[PDB]
Amino acid sequence: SAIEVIHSSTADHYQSKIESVYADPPEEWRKVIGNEFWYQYGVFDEKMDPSRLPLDASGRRHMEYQFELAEQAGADLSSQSIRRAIDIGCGWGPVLSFLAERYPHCERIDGVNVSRPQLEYASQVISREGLAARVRLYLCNAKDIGALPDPELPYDLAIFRGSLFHFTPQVLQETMQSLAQRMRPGGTVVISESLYKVDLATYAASGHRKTPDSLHKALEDNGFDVIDRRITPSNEEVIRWYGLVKDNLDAHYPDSRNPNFSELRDIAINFSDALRKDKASSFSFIARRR
Numbered sequence: 266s267a268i269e270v271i272h273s274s275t276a277d278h279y280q281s282k283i284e285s286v287y288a289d290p291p292e293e294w295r296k297v298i299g300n301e302f303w304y305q306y307g308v309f310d311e312k313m314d315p316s317r318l319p320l321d322a323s324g325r326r327h328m329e330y331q332f333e334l335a336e337q338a339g340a341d342l343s344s345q346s347i348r349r350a351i352d353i354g355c356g357w358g359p360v361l362s363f364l365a366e367r368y369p370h371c372e373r374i375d376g377v378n379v380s381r382p383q384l385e386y387a388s389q390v391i392s393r394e395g396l397a398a399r400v401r402l403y404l405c406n407a408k409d410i411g412a413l414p415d416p417e418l419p420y421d422l423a424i425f426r427g428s429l430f431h432f433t434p435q436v437l438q439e440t441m442q443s444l445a446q447r448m449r450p451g452g453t454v455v456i457s458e459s460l461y462k463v464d465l466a467t468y469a470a471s472g473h474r475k476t477p478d479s480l481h482k483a484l485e486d487n488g489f490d491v492i493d494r495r496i497t498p499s500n501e502e503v504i505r506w507y508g509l510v511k512d513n514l515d516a517h518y519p520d521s522r523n524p525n526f527s528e529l530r531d532i533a534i535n536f537s538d539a540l541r542k543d544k545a546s547s548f549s550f551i552a553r554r555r
């Protein structure tokens with residue numbers, strides 16, 4: 266199906282590296298991360314659907330839980346407040362379908378991604394679910410969201426679901442500044458990211474480690490209030506999530522043919538140990554535009 270292209274004024278030297286980690290067919294990825302392709306951890310509580318694959322169910326439940334945190338923290342998330350939404354680093358597109366279902370009167374849902382294979386998959390799912398009129402896909406670096414069409418229609422809602430970690434500090438700055446200009450006051454930003462809880466001096470395009478404080482500063486420097494900040498999911502749940510991903514890799518990619526899946530196994534093992542030692546956590550950040 267159709268994807269719109271958006272100019273890159275500045276040069277993200279890191280972009281082609283990020284693209285290569287997501288370049289493999291969705292048909293392969295399905296066997297590793299589940300049939301809905303959620304790719305930023307899971308919440309494994311009593312509201313999780315027991316009939317879907319744990320990765321699909323825990324992934325959806327994680328997104329739902331973040332909206333509950335945003336709501337409790339006083340985010341403007343009523344059905345009448347969300348007319349335009351953006352999914353920044355949208356992966357295979359599960360959040361686009363989630364947003365379309367949760368906000369059936371949301372006029373415009375923009376997904377931005379640098380991975381063509383991921384967007385071509387998302388395009389097929391959006392097309393087959395009949396959401397093509399509302400959901401728009403952009404082959405577009407997060408730093409270039411300033412050039413997305415119809416600037417007169419402001420963003421009410423922005424999602425950074427495990428995409429932020431791939432950004433250079435410069436791309437993070439350019440993305441947050443551009444989002445600030447395109448988002449109306451009281452617009453909600455929903456962030457999930459793996460952040461380090463130690464000084465980074467001591468240290469899958471997994472470079473550009475960040476901290477809660479580094480992310481907090483990037484938000485407040487670019488006209489966003491942080492209204493909720495906490496560990497989510499728990500280190501225990503994230504280790505469990507990596508466990509399920511590793512079990513799928515052991516089953517389907519035992520002899521580590523594919524370098525991207527070998528790299529993911531390494532991160533699953535190595536980052537799970539960092540989570541065990543409490544050197545890092547998954548964090549939910551809810552912010553709003555000033």
Ligand SMILES: Nc1ncnc2c1ncn2[C@@H]1O[C@H](CSCC[C@H](N)C(=O)O)[C@@H](O)[C@H]1O
Pocket residue numbers: 277283284287302303304305353354355356357358359377378379380383405406407408425426427428429431432436
């Ligand atoms: N500068 C950038 N601009 C756009 N997308 C980016 C980006 N850096 C990383 N990404 C994207 O961020 C995603 C990280 S994986 C997470 C995918 C999706 N948010 C989910 O929760 O399932 C990938 O799709 C990657 O291509």
